[PDB]
Amino acid sequence: QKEVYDAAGFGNPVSRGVHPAIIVVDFSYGFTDLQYPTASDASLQMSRTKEICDLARALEFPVIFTTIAYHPGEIPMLPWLEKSSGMAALLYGSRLVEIDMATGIQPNDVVVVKKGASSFFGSTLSSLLAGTNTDTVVVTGATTSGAVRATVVDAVQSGFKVLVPADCCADRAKGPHEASLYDIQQKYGDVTDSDDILKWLRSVAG
Template identity: 30%
Template sequence: MTEIDNAALDRMLQQAFETASQLYKERGFQRRVGFGSRPALISVDLANAWTRPGNPFTCDQEKMNGEIIPGMQKLLAACRANGIPVVHVTTAYEIPDRTSAFTDMGLWHCKIPIEVVDIANKDLWAIDSRIAPVHGEYTLLKKRASAFHGTELAGILRANDIDTIMVTGVTACACVRQTICDGLADGFRTIAVKECIGDRVPGAVAWNLFDIDAKFADVETVDTCMTYLNGLQRAAA
């Protein structure tokens, strides 16, 4: 789509959101879950296959380079300065052959091209070097959309007394959304970081964040999250 088309789409979405917001408020939606006292940052699929050009999973590069990566760099700096746990999530498969009699892809390959994320090609599923993990941060490998489904994530968070997850990454309509929904279902306060969530499809981020904010998480800006994170250190002092 052209810039003009995207601008028109944004205007239409905003008009739809205004109408829907009124309906939601009248019916008791859009409540706040709020920040807790023990947060962790969960970064979903900000690996090269999603953040860099040239892959079927590549997301909107303008938003990636202009908002998501810079926003993540700020969040990571605040987390590292304040001792906040960080989990980097990525996706890859050991048996990416669709004709194999047995594969760890399950049936997902029937819908999307997950066979292109081969665990043998580490560069594809490695976390983007601009936001690479540092010592003390955990990289979690998942096989499904949600970072919680079939993984150790919930157990790790509970073992460290985490009550709040700030979720970033891609894509808004799939892996980020599923992670947020499962996070809330597992009892964590869920925060979607507005500028640090992307997708491949125009309008997908805006629509999903609007809907997520109504039902599954608080959508908050990077600046709000930074203020919260830095305030934790002051409170502890």
């Protein structure tokens, strides 16, 4: 398998740019608080993302959070909600939608609302990144086999280099988790840890 992917030209390292942005994907209570059946254990990974975000905010790099939120009228309109009926609980005005405070989200941090898995689809994220002259995005969040991968794929397609720290990704199952990190490492971006991005961000700032 390793030989198959290497000959097909997968797994090459990405050369990092000099205008980073951090994207925090769906670290809302709906996905991080175990009282809701749609959530995973994200305690460790949220504290890792907190360190990254607190660094980037101090270094004046854009930090953008994303959440899934619906109006009651949108439920029958979106066929994704037929397949994943649990996402229908993610309603405007509810606690499920609010970003988890364990991330260290600051009032001036941009939150983008989305209706699908990918953070770029039907959202303003791409424009925010292009307007700030971003060349590299570090993707963090939940879930790794869900919204994270979908965001990762859409980010590379959109013209941005993708770094993903494994420290920072949470899923509800180990299998899907490893499969996505594998696919990303081969096809879409560099998989690393938080320790690498902390050092890298400091060196790009001077």
